[PDB]
Amino acid sequence: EVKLQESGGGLVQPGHSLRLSCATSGFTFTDYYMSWVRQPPGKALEWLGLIRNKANGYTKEYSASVKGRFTISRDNSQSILYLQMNALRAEDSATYYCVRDKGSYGNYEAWFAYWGQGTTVTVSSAKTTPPSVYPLAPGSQTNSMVTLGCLVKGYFPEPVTVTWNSGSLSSGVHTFPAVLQSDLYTLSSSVTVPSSPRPSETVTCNVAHPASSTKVDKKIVPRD
């Protein structure tokens, strides 16, 4: 199974460096070219460059927006694709993607067909802040479906992750995009459940903010 897995993303100060990686598996790494593409929040995809296969001497190509600052490379022993980023600017903030580029054939239908899930790079001088997780429970029942939620504020940077009852509760869920304010994010997540279960059968939101190694659980208790 073709597998692309990027990592390394996180918070980095302006002017500094960050090295990202992309673990591959499910195909012969050396036979393929590989590309790095990014997408800053809410904007377009951007091709940054690529590195060719071992038939092509593993040569490299770069976008003008990062040539001289970014270096691509690979570990043909472990099948890892790398992106060396030096002197990072605000514009460098985005989700980075590795893509299996061309191969030594004519399987064009597959070129750029495989992407990784992406890794969020945030270049800012702002300081990492753990989030605060609050209960969003109703006050006053004359309804069949009851909606609850969790409030995650004052954290930095993105991304946080939210799930309910460890995830067994996957339907009727809404996690709103985060809103930035004073170098601090805030987002809420709502979950809808039939009046029957909750409060009878507990409801919990699972909040994880890897950027500040924060992991909290807030059981939502009715107001009495």
Binding site: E109, F112, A113, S190
Partner: protein
């Protein structure tokens, strides 16, 4: 340095409707590739080499063009085709993508299921107070939220978030938050979440009253 411009930037289409997106290039490229990106996931290959469909793409789709003019066409719009489309040229280094077109899907009107919540005792202890209001699963998009505290409307301290068309039911959802000081919060007494949607000339509201208990 071929720059690609996509149009329209945004649009909506009813089921069965024919959709057409174009992508013009400042210079001439030999092939235009296309990508479908639904929110929160990685872009997919949707059309390669101008007119070749990618793995599993429905026949209703098709692409064409040459030189500096290209287009992706959907014969009959389906609800799943809702997403953002990206053209790309790998004709000259560096490879480039276009500005993208956000294609929305239409559907039957849906009144927003609203919910309001007072700050939690937890947050209070911090000297800060936040009232949260959810306006879930509505269609159309257009929605206006207003916070009224003891009759008087409040603007300072409100921050909103809008989700992208739900991939499961094609609706939209919004979250509104009014952050005040526990100090300011403890003065006022009534907090209302007022929403105006086309699904009612009658303003939709839900509120709560700060009760000592």
């Amino acid at each position: 340095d071929i720059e690609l411009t996509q149009s329209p930037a945004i649009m909506a289409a009813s089921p069965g409707e024919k959709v057409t997106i174009t992508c013009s290039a400042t210079s001439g490229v030999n092939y235009m590739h296309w990508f479908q990106q639904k929110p929160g996931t990685s872009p997919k290959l949707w059309i390669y080499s101008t007119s070749n469909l990618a793995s599993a793409v429905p026949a209703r789709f098709s692409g064409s063009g040459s030189g500096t003019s290209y287009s992706l066409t959907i014969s009959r719009m389906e609800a799943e085709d809702a997403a953002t489309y990206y053209c790309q040229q790998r004709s000259t280094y560096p490879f480039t993508f276009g500005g993208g077109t956000k294609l929305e899907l239409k559907r039957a009107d849906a009144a927003p299921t609203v919910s309001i919540f007072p700050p939690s005792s937890e947050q209070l202890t911090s000297g800060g107070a936040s009232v949260v209001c959810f306006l879930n699963n509505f269609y159309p998009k257009d929605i206006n939220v207003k916070w009224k505290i003891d009759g008087s409307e409040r603007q300072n301290g409100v921050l909103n978030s809008w989700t992208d068309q739900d991939s499961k039911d094609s609706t939209y959802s919004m979250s509104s938050t009014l952050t005040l000081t526990k100090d300011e919060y403890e003065r006022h007494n009534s907090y209302t979440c007022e929403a105006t949607h086309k699904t009612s000339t009658s303003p939709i509201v839900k509120s709560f009253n700060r009760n000592e208990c």
